[PDB]
Structure 1
Amino acid sequence: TGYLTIGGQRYQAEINDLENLGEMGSGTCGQVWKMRFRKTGHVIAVKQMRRSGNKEENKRILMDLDVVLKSHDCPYIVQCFGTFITNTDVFIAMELMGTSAEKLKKRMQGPIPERILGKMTVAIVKALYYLKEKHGVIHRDVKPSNILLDERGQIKLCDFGISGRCAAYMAPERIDPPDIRADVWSLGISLVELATGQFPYKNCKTDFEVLTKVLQEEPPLLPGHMGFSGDFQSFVKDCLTKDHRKRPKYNKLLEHSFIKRYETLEVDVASWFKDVMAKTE
């Protein structure tokens, strides 16, 4: 504690070293500030956890921090630059991302292109596989609000609930018991939602009505007439295997033709992202 490390360089720091650029509405019940580190001009996200704060909130902030601090070797999980501890507060300095896939979809007012969702799929599957294999963590809440993007073209799993521990994204076997395969289902619903710009059970008025459609209806499909590659349609069809005992695990998805393509294909996510942000001021 008491220092930040940013691109391998370690800087002594305390909270006085940071200029408060205002709240970021990340939809948490804890204060998160955008802050400028005066020593270097880096802009960062700083969580402020008050000693007098809500006990539920503080506990989950610390459980998430525990996983982030041990995830320095995953390029697909948002990183902690450092912590400051005072008599009344803990400040947690995080990588500042641009936005969440949920907000990106709201701003776009339409589909996100397959080539962006390909780079997103590689990153999030590798993140969830890293969490399970390295830390024994089942994430249990995969959805667009937990997928972060920035103007440098990085796509990372959010720290929010990253320790594990709506029901729009819930797998059939979690609704009605018969495991990482439930998160594979959530990923499939997230991809259909982002690819179409339409949540696949949209006309539901209550969370229970959504659960009834997950169980009673056919899994949602990518539409056939939007020029989606055969690889992307097959990837989503596999994720949305209703019987979980036939649904692939991450090690199997990581061999899928869709992920192999996007591991090596050059996609300028950064310029797409800045463009979308430009076309939407």
Structure 2
Amino acid sequence: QTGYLTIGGQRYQAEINDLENLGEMGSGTCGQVWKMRFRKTGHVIAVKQMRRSGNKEENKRILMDLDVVLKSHDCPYIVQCFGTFITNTDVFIAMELMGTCAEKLKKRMQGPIPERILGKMTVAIVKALYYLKEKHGVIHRDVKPSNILLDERGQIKLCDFGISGCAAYMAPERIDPPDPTKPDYDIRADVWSLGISLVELATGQFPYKNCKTDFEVLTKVLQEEPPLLPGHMGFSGDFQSFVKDCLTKDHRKRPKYNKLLEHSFIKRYETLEVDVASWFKDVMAKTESP
């Protein structure tokens, strides 16, 4: 009858009468996640259900991502777990509820997301990815706008549910690798995905234009110059250089996170006051659900 949620440094007793079911979070690839209000605090949280009867694989992956989240309590850029509740037949996982993902913001904006926002997102996501690798040995392997979450507090956090570690975002060196079935590669492939994601969000346009097939996209990644930010949109020199470095085609010359964290783009966005919160709220208030 009773579980526990820890939020804001405080542990709370929670019975079902304490939780208001506010419905689906939206069109996921996951399912069985609800937005719920915790009546004792007014926090709205996300609750994911893992059925004991569910697919072994899907469940093993959930548990692995959960393991990482539980050990990531010291990272501001990873979505936090508030609690778990195990019944005979299910496990419920309470998570910090974010507003939406960058993929959906792009759709709402019907175009470019401002540099200022993308700068703050870059700082957060690089730090999240770096944290994952350095603390937990996790190489994300799926950095894309759908895994970048924002909220109306102005927080920016990474996602993976997959955090335990998509041809469009594939680095060159990963396209026809020496050993694809024994895929022991490094974080530079994720750096490339980040650069793609930034160009896509900065332009409003996924950079591999009018490709009809996944293979055709891969041909573009290999044959074409990196899809650098355009020169005609008022992008800063630091943002353009940051994206160019991320999109270094030769992976041996592409920077790692520790080097990216020194980039002027990051240094400037660490210090720049940007009201991501108000901006997100305006967007969500003026646009419709994709």
Task: Report the TM-score when normalising by structure 2.
Answer: 0.94
TM-fit CA distance, 1:265: 0.6
- More displaced 10-residue stretch of structure 1: 31-40 or 62-71: 31-40
Q: Match of 2:230?
A: 223
Partner of 1:168, secondary structure, is: helix
2:160 & 2:248 partners in 1: Cα distance? 27
Tell me the alpha carbon deviations over residues 224-278 of structure 1, each in whole angstroms, 9 at most, x when there is no partner. Answer: 0111110000000000000000000000000000000001110000011111112
Alignment gaps of 5+ in structure 2? 179-185
For residues 276 and 29 of structure 1, do their structure 2 counterparts lie closer, same or farther at Cα, with a shift above 3 Å needed? closer
Matched-pair contact (CA < 8 Å) for 1:30–1:49: no
Greater displacement, 18-27 / 46-55: 18-27
Q: Runs in 1 of length 4+ with deviation above 3 angstroms?
A: none
In the alignment, the residues of structure 2 paired with residue 50 and residue 18 of structure 1 have an alpha-carbon distance, to the nearest angstrom, of 20
Q: 1:58, CA displacement in angstroms?
A: 1.1
Please report how far the alpha carbon of residue 26 of structure 1 lies from its aligned counterpart in structure 2 after TM superposition: 4.8
Equivalent position SS for 2:169? coil
Distance 1:173 1:14 in 2: 51
2:147 paired with 1:146: yes
**Equivalent-residue separation in structure 2 for 1:43 and 1:173 (angstroms):** 42
Contact 1:26 1:32 (8 Å CA) reproduced: no
Task: Give CA deviations for 1:155-212 in whole Å, capped at 9, x if unaligned.
Answer: 0001410001x21000000112260000000000000000000000020111111111
Count of equivalent residues: 280
Aligned position for 1:4: 5
SS of match in other structure, 1:223? coil
String of CA shifts for 1:90-132, please: whole Å, max 9, x gaps: 1100001000000000011010000000000000000000000
Q: CA deviation at 1:29?
A: 3.5
What secondary structure sits across from 1:152 in the alignment?
Answer: coil
Structure 1 Cα separation of the partners of residues 42 and 286 of structure 2: 27
Rounded Cα–Cα distance in structure 2 between residues aligned with 1:119 and 1:26? 26
CA distance in 1, matches of 2:121, 2:30: 27
Post-superposition offset of 1:38: 2.1
TM-score, with length taken from structure 1: 0.97
Identity of aligned residues (%): 100
Match of residue 19 from structure 1: 20
User: How far 1:88 sits from its partner (Å)?
Assistant: 1.1
**1:4-61 CA distance string (max 9 Å, x none):** 1111111012444312111112513330000111222211000011111222221111
Distance (Å, rounded) in 2 between the aligned partners of 1:29 and 1:161:
11
The range that moved more, 237-246 or 27-36, is 27-36
Contact 1:143/1:169 (8 A) holds in 2? yes
Q: Distance in 2 between matches of 1:103 and 1:241?
A: 27
